[PDB]
Symmetry: C2
Subunit: 304 residues, 2 copies
């Protein structure tokens, strides 16, 4: 009874982002995850330099054909994240579409990376938005947008928790049964150094489970945390199917331990009061193996 995941995201030689942030953790948890490297770069673009090559839509299709010709196109989950190419995203769609005809129970976990905010900056060309809205989101079962992307995808601005839950409702109608807004500008009663995370899941009649978590903000900028988050949400939602509460507590806790370790190590390498380089800030992935297998819970999600 193996669980197979096709994860189509970027690859870097040094460091952890994309498939590099998603693969080791999912393997450690027991998933037969296959990685399609959308690109292969020396390191992430947050460094002073980078070099690499990209996979084009034709090559992505060629790889799928090999899998299909061998009858190896039967997956339990599909996982996608940052893509900067309209043509590539469209091929992804055709593939998930076909994997779904092949296995109707397939769960597509989509991290709709578009940009972030007090105002916004896109990370992808503007023509991807319509594809995400019209072709990607409708195929997805789990999406993990941040506030800014939740707004973009729904066309509505979010100024509060209730408008956020209304925007998730609209996203559910677009198709996915699970929506988790991974970061927002909503205030927490816990302090200015906290942010709100909201999750919603539609699931015997039709019931809704909605949750809220208040989590500490990052005194720095880490790469690959959203890729890690999506991969972990996939794993924990798989293990605790009708419990978005526990699944998010484990996902977030796992992120906590990885970042905590990353932060201690980075400070121990940069100076005292010295802001660490992007290299020292790379996720301490391999060293958090035990936190990935069984993370100590350090957040409680409240059911709304």
């Amino acid at each position: 009874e193996e669980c197979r995941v096709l994860s189509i995201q970027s690859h870097v030689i040094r460091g952890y982002v994309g498939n590099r942030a998603a693969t080791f953790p999912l393997q450690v948890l027991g998933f037969e995850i296959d990685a399609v490297n959308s690109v292969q770069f020396s390191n992430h673009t947050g460094y002073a330099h980078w070099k690499g090559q990209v996979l084009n839509s034709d090559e992505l299709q060629e790889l799928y054909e090999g899998l299909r010709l061998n009858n190896m196109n039967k997956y339990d989950y599909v996982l996608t994240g940052y893509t900067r190419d309209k043509s590539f995203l469209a091929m992804v769609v055709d593939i998930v579409q076909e994997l779904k005809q092949q296995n109707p129970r397939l769960v597509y976990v989509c991290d709709p990376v578009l940009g972030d905010k007090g105002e916004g900056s896109m990370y992808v060309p503007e023509d991807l938005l319509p594809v995400y809205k019209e072709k990607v989101v409708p195929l997805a079962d789990i999406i993990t947008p941040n506030q800014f992307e939740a707004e973009l995808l729904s066309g509505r601005k979010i100024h509060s928790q209730e408008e956020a839950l209304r925007v998730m409702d609209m996203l559910h109608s677009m198709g996915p049964d699970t929506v988790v807004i991974t970061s927002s500008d909503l205030p927490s009663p816990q302090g200015s150094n906290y942010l709100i995370v909201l999750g919603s899941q539609r699931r015997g009649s039709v019931v809704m489970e909605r949750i809220r978590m208040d989590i500490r903000k990052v005194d720095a900028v880490f790469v690959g945390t959203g890729d890690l988050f999506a991969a972990m949400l996939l794993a924990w939602t798989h293990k605790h199917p009708n419990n978005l509460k526990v699944a998010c507590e484990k996902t977030v806790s796992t992120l906590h331990h990885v970042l905590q370790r990353t932060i201690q190590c980075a400070k121990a390498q940069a100076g005292e009061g010295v802001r660490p380089s992007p290299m020292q800030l790379e996720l301490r992935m391999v060293q958090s193996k035990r936190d990935i297998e069984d993370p100590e819970i350090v957040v409680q999600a409240t059911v709304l």
Copy 2:
């Protein structure tokens, strides 16, 4: 505290061979292994079908350039196996050369993939023009090599008909450069029957007193009547890992590497039986996590 490994080998979407058979295990053991994917194919070439792209020497050099520009060209180990093309293999040589000027203590683990003996004769798996390159450029930069008998014969230019002749070939190989030589598999007679294959290992080192000594071992291992791809890649990855933990104990490093292979293969065999096409024989990697972490010794090497 971290041990960085630069591993340049094939990548496949489905299955475990190349970087796919080498990465997860080394990450499980705590190594910061960076993978440069020399090809990206749907699955291994032992399947009825396969499609993919290959990385060329120019692209290999670009990626190295990125690591270089960020001053991330500092590794403790380099790991390589199946290489398909002369210019690619030469570029790999310029890279190891430089990593060694950067870190004179770097250990280059080289699996010199060339071919194998099938019937009355061997055949090559790569272009014949790689052989002079392995002899004159690669093997001399190598610290640990894992040839099968056929490859030890090509590299030494002497044919092997006995254990004693295998040991003389190992010495020639040591003189070419590598301080650790393992003839991972040979057609030599076993006092345990025709069902067994011989593994020979030899290591030269300077002891605390400054004396240069040599440890030699032999293992009589049972043959598996099936064709597994990726086992040579895993064996080299683990050889790297267990010689790193037991630097002056070849006997133990070898018993652990071999035992790890046994546990993986065995688990792969029970599964395959309970279902065998090449897909059925894929190494059960993620499920062998515990065995990779701390393998029960199931074979004892004899001291030569």
